[PDB]
Symmetry: C4
Subunit: 348 residues, 4 copies
């Protein structure tokens, strides 16, 4: 009866539940290191990865990304020959880093070969439920065939799942079940773990095997990134904040005089039609080139590490302290009792 009595024990935290407490600082925002190492083959100058979705990352996005010091993951919602071409395309553009997503399917190894042939630096085996036997067995197969290949497996939300995938041979683990802006998983399936807690629990375990974790989803301001990083993540992955960018796939859609870009979940009827969906379709404001959005994110990270007296991303993960707050805390934490006049480059 022990499981029957534990159903409602666990409590979970999300980004907007917390604040990073300022700490003794000696280091200024321009001075801090934002470098990060996923592995031997995989080093990033900025801890950003653009999501593997048909409205977020194709060749042009992955390249603009890699030249910012970050990383692109080509979505798998295309042919095999096509993804391999675009992966090779990013590689011929200055010999820089590139990712490709593969689903746990029958044609998975066929896709992976063609991808390793095009010289991917990391494949991402993405699935709804990374804590699954099929997902384990696949990572085992792939680890067997390509012992040299960076393997990103997700998604997971628990310690148990983080361990299952590490042991199967995945060297980077991906955290997030249901925090995405376009995600309906928690609504339609009732399943999830608040992202902060899920980064924190998966990192605690992953820390032991010296394995890094990517916070995926739920990030809507630069300060969310800081929180996710400080809660244990090595790197964050973004969808919505990148979808509005000129280099992202999909052509600009006009709306109320303004310019927008389509942004849909890979699990939406829209993405799949090209069945019970776990995602929706919509649009985000046109934002400009990747370059200014990148600027605002990193600068936020830079100011947070400054506040936290963290010289590198390591010191931040291992030293940053949070403070929990109520919903009224959240109200104070955003602008309040003033009517906004101008748009800020980092706020709505």
């Amino acid at each position: 009866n022990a499981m029957w009595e534990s159903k409602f024990v666990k409590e979970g935290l999300t980004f907007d539940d917390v604040l990073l407490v300022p700490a003794k600082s000696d280091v200024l925002p321009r001075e801090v290191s934002v470098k990060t190492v996923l592995s031997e083959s995989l080093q990033l100058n900025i801890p950003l990865i653009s999501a593997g979705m048909d409205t977020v990352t194709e060749a042009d996005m992955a390249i603009a990304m890699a030249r910012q010091g970050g990383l692109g993951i080509i979505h798998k919602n295309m042919s095999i020959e096509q993804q391999a071409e675009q992966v090779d395309k990013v590689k011929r553009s200055g010999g820089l880093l590139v990712g490709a997503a593969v689903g746990v399917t029958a044609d998975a190894m066929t896709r992976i070969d063609a991808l390793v042939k095009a010289s991917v630096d990391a494949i991402v085996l993405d699935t709804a439920h990374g804590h699954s036997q099929g997902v384990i067995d696949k990572v085992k197969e792939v680890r067997a065939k390509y012992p040299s290949l960076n393997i990103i497996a997700g998604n997971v939300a628990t310690a148990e799942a983080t361990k299952a995938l590490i042991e199967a041979g995945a060297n980077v683990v991906k955290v997030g079940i249901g925090p995405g802006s376009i995600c309906t998983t928690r609504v339609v399936a009732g399943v999830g773990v608040p992202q902060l807690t899920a980064v924190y629990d998966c990192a605690t375990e992953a820390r032991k095997h010296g394995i890094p974790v990517i916070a995926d989803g739920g990030i809507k301001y630069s300060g969310d990134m800081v929180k996710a990083l400080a809660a244990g993540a090595h790197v964050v992955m973004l969808g919505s904040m990148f979808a509005g960018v000129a280099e992202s796939p999909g052509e600009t859609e006009i709306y109320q005089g303004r310019q927008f870009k389509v942004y849909r979940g890979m699990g939406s009827v829209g993405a799949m039609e090209k069945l019970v969906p776990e995602g929706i379709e919509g649009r985000v404001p046109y934002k400009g080139p990747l370059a200014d959005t990148v600027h605002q994110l990193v600068g936020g990270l830079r100011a947070g590490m400054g506040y936290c007296g963290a010289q590198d991303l390591e010191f931040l993960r291992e030293n940053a302290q949070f403070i929990r707050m109520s919903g009224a805390g959240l109200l104070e934490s955003h602008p309040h009792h003033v009517q906004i006049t101008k748009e800020a480059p980092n706020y709505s």
Copy 2:
């Protein structure tokens, strides 16, 4: 004698939107999982869904469509004894379909049950505002005495003491939910309730000890809430709202707010009481038209299969016994719905 007074405020209650089901090790796919449940020795559903015995939800056409999706429908009692019998008769003739009927706690109650059973009703539901009553308990005994083979679903209850009381009265199944209803105002007019997830849980806890199943009834807005109700301990769930905008439900379509809509109302609302015949405990409204019951039920189950997939649950018994929740704040709720993106299309299972 101070114990009762010092304890007025010790209990805490959780609901659907306070929690999330935690993903567990899975070796099963949504399609591989089984959603069948056994409610008793004569009542078995292929999907854990029951359409509410309300006058804007279930009549003969609703029950027939329900039974065909693998579920069940409860024919409401806002009609004549005779007419309700015909409706049960009608459902029965269309392929040996299952069907339930609602009966109130009155003096006409035995007379009404006599007809529904001669009509071959597969279960009766004694629905009341306060299922923890002598009036209810004595009526459940009275029926169980007369009809010892009859599937009795009794309610509504929100407590373990109450669930135990109706089981020892002879109830096969216990219906859980005081005040959780979408059209319901009980908690506002009378102050009384238990948050649904906790009510299902405390009750499932008692019903288990005796081998009795509970029915989660009310407060389900999306399919994820169904998984939560089942995972909390309910064998089966009862939906009003999610079903009222279906083609097979009674009533006609009307255009409102620029599209098609159906009338949805509470049985304790001023409207519904006029037809049937105290201070009202429900309101009258309308919900969007959704077309055939089939497409709705396909999303319902589809979400259920997805959840159980995430929970490594090959069947509903596993999900009841094993699923773990994690409590979350209001901010957790916001992360759990689509956010910070403008939606351009009604998704089949969202808004």
Copy 3:
């Protein structure tokens, strides 16, 4: 010491919307329950409702209507002494009806009270912002010393210590509520309050020990809040907002965007007061028609409340009802949701 410093944030407060009443075994139906209540040997009420002693809620006509429904009106003090004395007189010579009058702590308090006792007032209500004031305590004492029989309702307090203090000065009834009122801005303008549910309970905890009934005053937006207040230990509740749109309330009906409305305002707002800054605002509520249709919906909900708790009477309810606590999500589930509302119900707007 350093005790006061470290305990600044220890306490926790709950309000009507924090909580639900748990359904209990019930032998009884709504129509069979008793809603009578006894404030004191002199004052007994057929229904647990007093109307607020404000200049836009209760004058003679309200007080008379209340009494006739089995409740009680408090005639506010925003008039002259001769005006309030004849207001009482009118209510009394209108069938031998119970009536109450407001008095504040000040110089001519005794003269007004003198005039009120002469006119046969049943209960004097010592309305002040801070019942736990030294000046309030001194005044309750003087009135008790002069009128050993007279019912004294003294308010307002939010703490067990204040309640204890009023009871010892001679108060027969204590009125509980700092800040929860619909028209009130005390909490906002002065940072000061206690959540009404915790307040009623805390004071009831102290008052029960001396057998003194408390009034849960302000904060009631629906029928169930009243069930909650009584179940938290109040003997009776006092309403202003729920009663302000009633036909027998002072104030003529005003037209605004076509719909009938009535003026409703705090007694500490600018208009009512005409040295200190306002602690109230001035507003408007829809017309509701006769008091009786409003009372019937109120008692109706109370009765359904009592039937769900298995309470034959209000003493059972006070001593036995159990609450359960919930988050914001639970309150969202507690109100009707995910449905367009078509028409108004007579008890939910």
Copy 4:
């Protein structure tokens, strides 16, 4: 159990509270509001007759605000978004208007000493060493550098939200510590940088540290109503600093624009794009507008009125009593809802509400 894993497993332990979370608990009172004392001592040479400082923002304080505040018994901080000689002129302008107290902000920069020199020459009564992060090595280094050169100068340093941080500035020479990272109405620090401590707790944790040394603290940011000020003082602050409640009064800088029939003034953060441009950047504030409130004397009379009310509610005769004794009760979001006007359509403006 190790040294390495201490910080890791304390990450989520702390709890923060803010104004909207709590309520002051009424206590026995023998004192009427008009009898209480709102006088407050920040240091031997800096006594305020009312507990209110006009924040040092370009949309808030300049000579006219500073003058008007002082004549009410408060203080104004001339902002630094202007030249050195200009800022000293503003100071002299206030000092040559009846020897009114004035303070003036200075950041941590090479010219800081040049500026400080110029302000002291103008008889400034306090320098506010104002920075985004009070707990920075530079800020401590500056306080020390200034204290050394000006042993009698009043040095108000900010901004911090922790006892650890508050101890550093005190040990470095600040007479008065300013509290608040993120609570500001025009602030986005918490959104863009993720960082902050809820202001009520922040005021409390710092006051706890500071009172051991006999040092006052300033609640800076987050006050929307007079009641919030009272919570802030009762949480341990000697005095509050206000932006948005002062931003839209006659004496504040800015023209009177009008939209939809009503009067407004611009109010922007100092970390906003607008404020920076005056002297790509990654802002930590936003620009907007607030209602025109009219002459300062009205906002101030309402403010001090709320305070006296709450002190009477708390049986406080002076602010020291309130700091030492005031108790809070914690509430939820249904309580905050009950704590505002509800279920009535408000038909006119209370001078102190909305």
